[PDB]
Amino acid sequence: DPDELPLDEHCERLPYDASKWEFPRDRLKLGKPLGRGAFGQVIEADAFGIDKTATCRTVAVKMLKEGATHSEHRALMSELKILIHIGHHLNVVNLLGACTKPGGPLMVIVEFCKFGNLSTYLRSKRNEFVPYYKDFLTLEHLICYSFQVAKGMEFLASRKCIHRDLAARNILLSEKNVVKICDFGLARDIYKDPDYVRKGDARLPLKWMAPETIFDRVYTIQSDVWSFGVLLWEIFSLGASPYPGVKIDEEFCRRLKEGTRMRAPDYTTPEMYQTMLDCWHGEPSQRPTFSELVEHLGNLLQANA
Numbered sequence: 001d002p003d004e005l006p007l008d009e010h011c012e013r014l015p016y017d018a019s020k021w022e023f024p025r026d027r028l029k030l031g032k033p034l035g036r037g038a039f040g041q042v043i044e045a046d047a048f049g050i051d052k053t054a055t056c057r058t059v060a061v062k063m064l065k066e067g068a069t070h071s072e073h074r075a076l077m078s079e080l081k082i083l084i085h086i087g088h089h090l091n092v093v094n095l096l097g098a099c100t101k102p103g104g105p106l107m108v109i110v111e112f113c114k115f116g117n118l119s120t121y122l123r124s125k126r127n128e129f130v131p132y133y134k135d136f137l138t139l140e141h142l143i144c145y146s147f148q149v150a151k152g153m154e155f156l157a158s159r160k161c162i163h164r165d166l167a168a169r170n171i172l173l174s175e176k177n178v179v180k181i182c183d184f185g186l187a188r189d190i191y192k193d194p195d196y197v198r199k200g201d202a203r204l205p206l207k208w209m210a211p212e213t214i215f216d217r218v219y220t221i222q223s224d225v226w227s228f229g230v231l232l233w234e235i236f237s238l239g240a241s242p243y244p245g246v247k248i249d250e251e252f253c254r255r256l257k258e259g260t261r262m263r264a265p266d267y268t269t270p271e272m273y274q275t276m277l278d279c280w281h282g283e284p285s286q287r288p289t290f291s292e293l294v295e296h297l298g299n300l301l302q303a304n305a
């Protein structure tokens, strides 16, 4: 049903309103790289007056790199188009502008998120965590981050988009404990990153993928719910790697379809662990929706206080 169909499958027909989004290249001061893949990269920049008149703003710019071809260039343009269609939400990395004019590289300019990816950040805070000390993480923070990602994903779903690589490495942490969903995409070196496992010609985030995705190449909002459950485990393990000590092979995939699930992580509550189990239902339609996750996590956040 084309009304169920994720926008992004048909990105090429979406509009690029240059009068709204185009940002002069001479108003962008490029700085240090923030991430590089084989074909893409993100670099830090200072943008003069991109979102507020005459004010310097630190931003992140996604662009291509040596190795990329015309097809990566097309892909980045369609990424720009989907970000415009999606629009602004607190809990999604916000598009600020683009440089698309001939003579320079295509640049997709988004907000800079001070503390980087959530996995790395949580893993740095094992010694600065208490369940209930300024700058210490607490159980409240962790539940709050969970709630925030569910809000951003509910928003993504409302825009008829799905994620396909939802994981703590694709959550950014800003000031004031705001987390933002992103997708590094081409700016991540998936061939060097052990989170992506060779499967055919592709390198795939198998530990985050729902059984229907692994076996039938089916991507839906409900397979995103499965990944959200894995993200929850990452949050409540303070950034540990999923399925610890487990070879990700055909027998891993088999046991998963059979019903094997991860054990509770070190910092979880019982109801957070049950929520992970819910997200990991074998049948996609029996998983909670993001709207249901929002309501439930909102209740947990309230109960925690």
Ligand SMILES: CNC(=O)c1cc(Oc2ccc(NC(=O)Nc3ccc(Cl)c(C(F)(F)F)c3)cc2)ccn1
Pocket: 034, 035, 042, 060, 061, 062, 079, 082, 083, 086, 092, 093, 110, 111, 112, 113, 114, 115, 116, 117, 156, 161, 162, 163, 172, 181, 182, 183, 184
């Ligand atoms: C220390 N701080 C940093 O290193 C840092 C690095 C950044 O790098 C990035 C720059 C741009 C992006 N681009 C997206 O995210 N593109 C995207 C595409 C589809 C869809 Cl669907 C989505 C969505 F909606 F899921 F969000 C997002 C990702 C990361 C940003 C901020 N800070």
